[PDB]
A paper describes a structure:
In this work, we produced recombinant HRP in E. coli and obtained an X-ray structure of the ferric enzyme at 1.63 Å resolution. The structure contains a total of 306 residues with 15 α-helices (148 residues) and 2 anti-parallel β-sheets (6 residues). HRP contains four disulphide bonds (between residues C11–C91, C44–C49, C97–C301, and C177–C209), which are highly conserved among the class III peroxidases and observed in our structure. Additionally, there are two calcium ions present in the structure, although not in the vicinity of the active site. The distance between the heme iron and the Nε atom of the proximal His 170 is 2.0 Å, while that between the heme iron and Nε of distal histidine (His 42) is 6.1 Å. An ethylene glycol (EDO) situated at the δ-heme edge of the active site is at 4.0 Å from iron (Fe–O2). Ethylene glycol does not interact with the heme iron, but potentially forms hydrogen bonds with the distal histidine (O2-Nε = 2.7 Å) and arginine (O2-Nε = 3.1 Å, O1-Nη = 3.0 Å) residues. There is no distal water molecule within the bonding distance of the iron on the distal side, and there is no ferulic acid binding at the δ-heme edge (as has been observed in previous HRP structures). Hence, multiple steps of crystallization may have led to the removal of ferulic acid from the HRP active site, which was occupied by ethylene glycol during cryoprotection.
Of all the heme peroxidases, horseradish peroxidase (HRP) is arguably the most iconic. Heme peroxidase enzymes are highly proficient in oxidizing small aromatic substrates, but HRP is the most proficient with catalytic activities that far outpace other peroxidases. Such high activity, producing easily detectable coloured or fluorescent products, makes HRP a very sensitive diagnostic tool in a wide range of biotechnological assays. But the native enzyme, as isolated from horseradish roots, is heavily glycosylated which has hampered its successful crystallization for decades.
Residue numbers in the entry: 1 to 306
Write the structure that this text describes.
Amino acid sequence: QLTPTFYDNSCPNVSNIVRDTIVNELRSDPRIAASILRLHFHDCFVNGCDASILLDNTTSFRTEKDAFGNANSARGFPVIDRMKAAVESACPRTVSCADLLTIAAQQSVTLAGGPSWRVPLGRRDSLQAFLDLANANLPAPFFTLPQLKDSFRNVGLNRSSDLVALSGGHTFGKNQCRFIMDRLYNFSNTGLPDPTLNTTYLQTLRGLCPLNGNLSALVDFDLRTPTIFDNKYYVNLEEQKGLIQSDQELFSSPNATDTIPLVRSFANSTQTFFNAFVEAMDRMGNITPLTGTQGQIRLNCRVVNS
Ligand code: HEM
Ligand SMILES: O=P([O-])(O)O
Ligand SMILES: [Ca+2]
Ligand SMILES: [Ca+2]
């Protein structure tokens, strides 16, 4: 029962406030649009899009920010605080942090050249955070294709089109050397590189991520257009130039009979990818929301109201 018109009477300019915050932030941090999209993904995969990920530690629950998928990885929380403060100034006690993050994710994709659409709204904010659930639910870059599929199925995204389209989020943003070292030097305990990685690209990545190098050094997910939201992600996969294992699995796994045609169709038509990305984003945004009088309108996104 989420609806795109939820704030049309109570805070009609919310989307513009969000967009203006991201644009101002992009002036100093060109990565923030990618980081915000990822925060929304990590919100939704853990008890639904309920802003659980934004809560700080308390003595009764641990923050999801300490999860393996978030710690020293997720970023942009201060930007969310800034846009929440601005929306609170304009429409007090009205817009949930969960909806704010959803809007910010959509605006981030559009600002980077991606599709533009009106997200469903009406989510409410959780009363707790779910660290253990984050550690169980968030997929990992060394997952095989059946494990990736199971990770999406576990949160309610059954369709291979969900997985292939949402993986297109890696058409922009950055990845730490840590998560590709195995592919470059010791894949599956062979002491050898991943044979599905293009051998010329292998040499490039070894130059960026040497053995004994800084594991926190960042590499672009999309070697073609690292900052533009477009379908080049899938073109890379067809050339064996997916960056992390879970990217290339979509095209090269023995289990990819159903994902290969999707990768090819998205590589062949930007419109096909953009349509599928919006559809999959709206489904992800629909994972187990609190609505109505459930949850609250959190006033400070880091803490429950008191
Ligand atoms: C399918 C399983 C997925 C896996 C295994 C995965 C894994 C990763 C990893 C390892 C990173 C780098 C994090 C770091 O270096 O600290 C990353 C970044 C990113 N992920 Fe994914 N991810 C997945 C799905 C998604 C989805 C569904 C989205 C959004 C629709 C997404 C959007 C992003 C973005 C935008 C970044 C870059 C963030 C930044 O530069 O701050 N990913 N992901
Ligand atoms: O796939 P649905 O029916 O949970 O939207
Ligand atoms: Ca959540
Ligand atoms: Ca791109």
